[PDB]
Amino acid sequence: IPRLSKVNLFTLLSLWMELFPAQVKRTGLVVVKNMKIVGLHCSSEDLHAGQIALIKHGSRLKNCDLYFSRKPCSACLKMIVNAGVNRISYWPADPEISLLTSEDAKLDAKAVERLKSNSRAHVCVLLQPLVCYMVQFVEETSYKCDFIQKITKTDFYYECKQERIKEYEMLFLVSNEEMHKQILMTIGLENLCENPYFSNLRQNMKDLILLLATVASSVPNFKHFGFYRSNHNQSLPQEIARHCMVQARLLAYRTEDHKTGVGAVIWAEGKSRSCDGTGAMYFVGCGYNAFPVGSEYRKFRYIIHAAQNALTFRCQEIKPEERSMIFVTKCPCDECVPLIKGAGIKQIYAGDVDVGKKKADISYMRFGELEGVSKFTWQLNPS
Amino acid sequence: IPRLSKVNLFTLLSLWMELFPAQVKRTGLVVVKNMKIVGLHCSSEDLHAGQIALIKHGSRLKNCDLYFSRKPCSACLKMIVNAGVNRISYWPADPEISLLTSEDAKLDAKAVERLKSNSRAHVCVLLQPLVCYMVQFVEETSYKCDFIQKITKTDFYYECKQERIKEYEMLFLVSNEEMHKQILMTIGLENLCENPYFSNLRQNMKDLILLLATVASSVPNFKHFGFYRSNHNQSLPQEIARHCMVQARLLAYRTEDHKTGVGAVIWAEGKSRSCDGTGAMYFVGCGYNAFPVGSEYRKFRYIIHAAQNALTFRCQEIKPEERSMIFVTKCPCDECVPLIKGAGIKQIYAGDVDVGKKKADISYMRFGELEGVSKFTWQLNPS
Amino acid sequence: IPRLSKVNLFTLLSLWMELFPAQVKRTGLVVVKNMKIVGLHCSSEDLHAGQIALIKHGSRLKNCDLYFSRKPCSACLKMIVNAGVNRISYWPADPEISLLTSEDAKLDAKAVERLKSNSRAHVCVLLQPLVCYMVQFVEETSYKCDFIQKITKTDFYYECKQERIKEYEMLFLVSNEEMHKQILMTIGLENLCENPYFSNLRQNMKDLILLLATVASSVPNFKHFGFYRSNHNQSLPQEIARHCMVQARLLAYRTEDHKTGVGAVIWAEGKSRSCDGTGAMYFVGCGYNAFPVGSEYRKFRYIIHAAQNALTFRCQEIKPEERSMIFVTKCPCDECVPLIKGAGIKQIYAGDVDVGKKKADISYMRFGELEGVSKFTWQLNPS
Amino acid sequence: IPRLSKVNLFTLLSLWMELFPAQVKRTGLVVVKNMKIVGLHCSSEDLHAGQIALIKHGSRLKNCDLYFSRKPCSACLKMIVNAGVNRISYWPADPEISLLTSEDAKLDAKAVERLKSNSRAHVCVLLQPLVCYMVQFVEETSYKCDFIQKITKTDFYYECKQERIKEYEMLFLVSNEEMHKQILMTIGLENLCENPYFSNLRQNMKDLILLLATVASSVPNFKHFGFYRSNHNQSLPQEIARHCMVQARLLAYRTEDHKTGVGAVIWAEGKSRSCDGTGAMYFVGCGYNAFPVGSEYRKFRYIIHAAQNALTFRCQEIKPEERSMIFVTKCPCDECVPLIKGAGIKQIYAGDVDVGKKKADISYMRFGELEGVSKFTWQLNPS
Amino acid sequence: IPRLSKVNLFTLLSLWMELFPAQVKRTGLVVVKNMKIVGLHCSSEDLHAGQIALIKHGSRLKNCDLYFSRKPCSACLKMIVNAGVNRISYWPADPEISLLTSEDAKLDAKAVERLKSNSRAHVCVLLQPLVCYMVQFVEETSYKCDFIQKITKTDFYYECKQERIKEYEMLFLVSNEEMHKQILMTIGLENLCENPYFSNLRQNMKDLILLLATVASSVPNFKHFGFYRSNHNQSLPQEIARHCMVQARLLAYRTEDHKTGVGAVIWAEGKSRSCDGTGAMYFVGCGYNAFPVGSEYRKFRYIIHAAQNALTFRCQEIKPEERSMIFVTKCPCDECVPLIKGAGIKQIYAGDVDVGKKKADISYMRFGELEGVSKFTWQLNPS
Ligand SMILES: [Zn+2]
Ligand SMILES: [Zn+2]
Ligand SMILES: [Zn+2]
Ligand SMILES: [Zn+2]
Ligand SMILES: [Zn+2]
Ligand SMILES: [Zn+2]
Ligand SMILES: [Zn+2]
Ligand SMILES: [Zn+2]
Ligand SMILES: [Zn+2]
Ligand SMILES: [Zn+2]
């Protein structure tokens, strides 16, 4: 099966983080340390994505790969290169200081280039072309996901997917070819301004947005479907729950071991005010189905599930007093439910498609009779 | 004087952690990083020792030596090797999935062997033969310990020692040679099934259990003896206090310099629910008398006391809101009492034998007149 | 412009930490890791500076540069070298155990020498001579600082300067050459007892005390001037606020190339008891105006402000429930105010000379319109 | 079987290197890098052992453990601590500048002590007590060695051992307790001047000399026995061949889990002048019959032979123009002969006791018809 | 005493290497690894300095600081950064492709700037201002050097110094204000084109050429003075001997703390053809008087002499077949002569001013009767 690239996932997550529900445009950000995500940020109405990462992490940004969805401003670049970041990737579309307006915006882009030159920071573009079968694979698996299939049991997917394609291309892409060349010249990408490198970057940029609109439509806003109980115990806002579930869906395409991909993400809600664009919520960990590191490949009994990787490679600890949520694309197995409950995760969001089913090596019986953790599943509103 | 080996102490502590007061058998665990204990776990009624370590530590298990008291199951082994552990030692007896019953257990043991070979971490047995004088030295010092000597002032020790020997032999040892050979064949120790490598392992396994029963009897349940106030402020359960004190007694035999060994262990009680087999309690730090690292050797003004090493080489911080207590085998000196009080440790458990004594380079006067820290000492129940 | 030496600042801060408001004398301490300050400690009436560092840091003292204001005692030296400190600088004045009295004091100093020889850590003296222009540069800038200039708007600075010169000479210096030679022979600096290496050390010691009394007088006690609100929300004690502001003033002289030096320090106040000599307050971070690490380069557009450096290279995290204070020598700019507010810093202490100004590349308009953060500025008491 | 310690072997080899045939006494030296010998030196009539190592290695002494047979003088110590050596072990009998005479010698020892104090090099004594069965094991295995058995088939061994004991103890040991007491006071070993540490060190020193005289006598100068060919190509001098064979015989006691021990050493003869005390010859590599660096568990099929270890962990390369010879205690097997011939080793010195024998997992048939390499075997002089 | 800076000495040596006797201009180069010189190169008539370093070192240029005397061309820069060099310092007077002529030269400079921008290696200028007493100190000591004093005992020094000042400033400096201003604009040094940074760089550049002309005149071509034998034996060409002696004379000012600074350099002559600008002659090692590294500090007894540092920190080995010679400013002591003779150095060049003298802790008696090593001393031609 096709496997999503690491730099393509961190780029896709950065674009998705820009769409977190809430002259200078919004910017998402992914902070990656040792090829593991250690933070997902968004630009609040007060601060920037590159400045929130400095507040949240500080000197811990040393030797970190930062993936912005817009080129960071001069103020936001000097602070992160001083922190110690070694790689700053960005989406080659309109930067943070909107060039589609100004003298200040155009002059600021020049300052970034001078700052990029005399500094050792690898401010570059890590965007990569996808595999030919990747876009077909994502569309095929999205229609079979636990969320589209749940609605089917109640044509709509393609209709909703087209709207996301329109919405995510007037936001993450410069439709005009002449406008994009101006931006690429202004942000120090002259070698990418000439064909076929201009068309290669543009095609791949459109290629990744199609994948994002395909994944984002797999957890759709449609006919009042959301995450609700089957009976803290309070549900998240539906916009946040769907956004965090798409993050798990994106991680599900990093799966390497099984033909069916599972991805999980852990989010916790602070009890105090926060400077991030996500609000009180912050990112705890993420993971996907994979073999143990080192190629440790009965074939399913040597895999680390999505929930287990999230609890293993987590940056922030689970605060007992806080409300911490986990978003698993599928029903947690009998192996992961004790770990999720044991780790102190208060709420579980998943798709109750495999619930109650016993297989040869995996079982989904503990999820249904789980006590102590609130389980929200994709379904119609009981009210 | 004989000095306990590092791998022998981590093996003994793992066996002792299995006896923490509270198909698949209980397992103790010692997580060691940079030759320093950074966690003492036990198998809860819900989770496993290997899975609890993943929850408590996560990715911090990287480059860690884990000492189980039973061979971890395939589920627990795949997670810890994924986290990045370095050396998975285990007690070469009945594994976690009990072989003394089943087809599922035998298949699971095979699954570990395939995972052991595919993976990189060294799943080995670090059990070592004891020094010839070690067992005699341990018995000699245990009769002169601050707890047995306190009892005599108010023949019994050997009577209690024999009972522990019987109890710990039917638990940590396979008495039947036929049964043990089946286990060693099943758990991949084929080259330890033939003599003299079969009697060597069996003798050493029995040799360490004799040492454990000797140390465990030095803090005995006898004539309603426990840790009570000499007159939070609430005492720990007597089973927990004695268990944590034997941990300090085990560390006291790593004392390299001074003729009398003192060991200390710090435990803290969380205010929330926990997934560990020890309950709300968790391990903060441990230490013993030793010269400053790097062989920095009066001969007593260059020694780092047991309390000071525990405060120095501690994994978890002392939470001011939590109830944290320290178990020191001997009365804390006038040098360690301010450090224990200053660090925020709420309770002190020790043997008030040296209390009030004024030696040349060491004094025990500040312990008696200590304000702000609850002091529990080995004595009769006042009520 | 003159730039303060890295080891001269850590030496000056250690002397200043000894003056934190509250047989054995007080001792200040600076813990430096990777050339960044990770702790500022004083000596409480119960504990020592070298023992408080062990409590606050523990094993985190590994590979740390410790700058004491007095030579640590044998008890304090053995604990820090056990932790893993590599370099222990000290002020070559009277040590912690006062030699200006005793047989116990003189024997303890000899014990340190054996410990210093036996151990590996570099117990040395890093005091360095100042630049010729440095001493009058500090005096010139101090008279033009935001605090002396504020008073003049309401011939006095030199009277304060002389008083602190007298106060800091009878405290940090041994005026008698006979007494100092005895101390230097006792504390193992026998090669510094002979000229010209005896007058060189004494001259350097006098130059730093002259510089310290110059900086300390820049935030004077003249009249009723203090840090009051420009109408938690409660002000710090005036002695603490002035002391913490002088720390920022000392950091302001590490400014890389900018003509005007700005320094910031962040302090937080815990709600529980503490063992430190500073009380409940602990040190969060420090910084100064400087270009991004790696010598990055309109010239002001590529500089990291004092507040931004403090937020980046901070050891402790900003606890939302605690009281956090930042002391910036100049008025925070429009770049730093969102970061200080975003980071959760509850109170701002700063000057108000530049408030309301609109320069070309910098503005000070958001400070006046700041909501949610208490602002304290150098002014007379409104009451 | 008793396995010789690393620091005991490097100490034993340093003593043996002092006996290389050729006010200030001759000194042997072993240079160890990554626990592998990278040089064997002796004090020439012109230079010192510590100065020859600097010439032969230079900056390569960085992070190396040097094992002298006498405490290096001030000139030798300052040059090797400059190079960057890690540990400088020595035999605590009599330093290079002999104290059994002078004011200059006594003054120099004090200079070494001051140089040790202010430097970070671990100038220590790594001498360790032997295992109880070690001395008996060496004695019994020496009568069954390939060289004593050869003479037997043509009571003498004990007679040769006794005279070696007299010679080696008179040279490597200070017989007078008072005289040795003075030396340990002079060379900064006061803590070893008090019983039982004075008797422990003295007993351990005699234990290693007894072992050395046992190993040295195993390749005895009895009658006209030596290493002769079986009718370059010229034989080494018999004193050199016997000395180098004992080196290969001392390595034989590092054997890992194999009842019969095999050790190898490779020496090459330079075509030009040399500053070493060994003459034109230099040390190429050493190795003992042992398992791979990890574990390899028919059990003989996974053990690395002595010749293979020497060719693997060799410091100097085999120059085709030079005359290089290898000394192996046992006859090279059919597996090692192609490697020795292939590596370019010109001459082989061995014991032809098990030559021509074909065992199950090992054969010795290729040695008899080895073409291109001159084979010298322990035998009586043909003429 | 003033001490020459590291980056300030490697700059001086690079300029001096340009003057090695033999459109595009000759360029000297210093390759520095771990703050130790590992190569001195000059631009041959067929190759460039940056290309000879690649041939001589290859991949060993990784993590090396290269100090060119002219900015390397685009061809030379791309290969050295491909090798993995760390810093490329240069003398900001005129690049390799001379700008004082062309369109090709001006275009080439732009290519270097683009190459430096998108690459990672620090192409910077490490030139530093001299200490105030430095220039006077060198002028005073040079008149008292072994070579000026030798001629004096046979006013001239100042006359030769002025000629070197006239020659070296015409070559290493751009006298015209406008021409140097244009070059700094062309080579991407616009930040140094504005006062006072234009006058600062020009003044410091003049200070070093004055320093170089002062040192280069300390070994003058006055009358028929040269290095001739006191009583291979063949001497070097007088131009080469004087040039190599000035290298030693330059390192004499790197001496840690001695009024009598001593510097040494070792050179060897290959028997075959070479691509370097120095011919078959290549650089072996260099050194100066200094205390042992590691804070080491009868003061002269703990000083590693210039010859000893040269042998310790040599890069190339002393090949017996080649002709290798050492240049020491002072007469080798009785301690360094055995090491120079032992290391295999064939010839010694020195100043026989203090030959035969016997001080307290140093003697110069062994140099007079040194057999086996050819000795050449500064004297009049015996013909
Ligand atoms: Zn921005
Ligand atoms: Zn699962
Ligand atoms: Zn388990
Ligand atoms: Zn104590
Ligand atoms: Zn102290
Ligand atoms: Zn600012
Ligand atoms: Zn010597
Ligand atoms: Zn063999
Ligand atoms: Zn070139
Ligand atoms: Zn010398």
Residue numbers in the entry:
A (entry chain B), B (entry chain A), C (entry chain C), D (entry chain F), E (entry chain D): 30 to 51, 84 to 162, 167 to 219, 226 to 302, 310 to 375, 391 to 476
Can you quote the paper on this entry?
Unlike DCTD, CDADC1 contains two CMP/dCMP-like deaminase domains (IPR002125), connected by a long (>100 residues) linker within a single polypeptide chain, resulting in CDADC1 being approximately triple the length of DCTD (e.g. 514 residues in human CDADC1 versus 178 in human DCTD). The C-terminal deaminase domain (CTD) of CDADC1 contains a potentially active HAE motif, but its N-terminal domain (NTD) appears to be naturally inactivated due to the mutation of the proton shuttle glutamate (the HAG motif instead of HAE), suggesting noncatalytic function. In this work, we provide biochemical and structural evidence that human CDADC1 deaminates dCTP and CTP.
CDADC1 apo hexamers are less tight than trimers, with a contact area per protomer of ~270 Å2. Each protomer from one trimer interacts with two protomers from the other trimer. With one of them, it is arranged in an antiparallel symmetric manner. One potential contact point between the pair is the “blob” in the map where two trimers are the furthest from each other (~7 Å), between two C197. The blob is likely derived from the partially structured 1–28 region. The interaction with the second protomer is more direct. It is achieved by symmetric hydrogen bonds between guanidino groups of R185 and carbonyl oxygens of A186, located between Nα4 and Nβ5 of the NTD. Therefore, we conclude that this interaction is likely the dominant force for hexamer formation in the absence of substrate, which highlights the important role played by Nα4 in both trimer and hexamer formation.
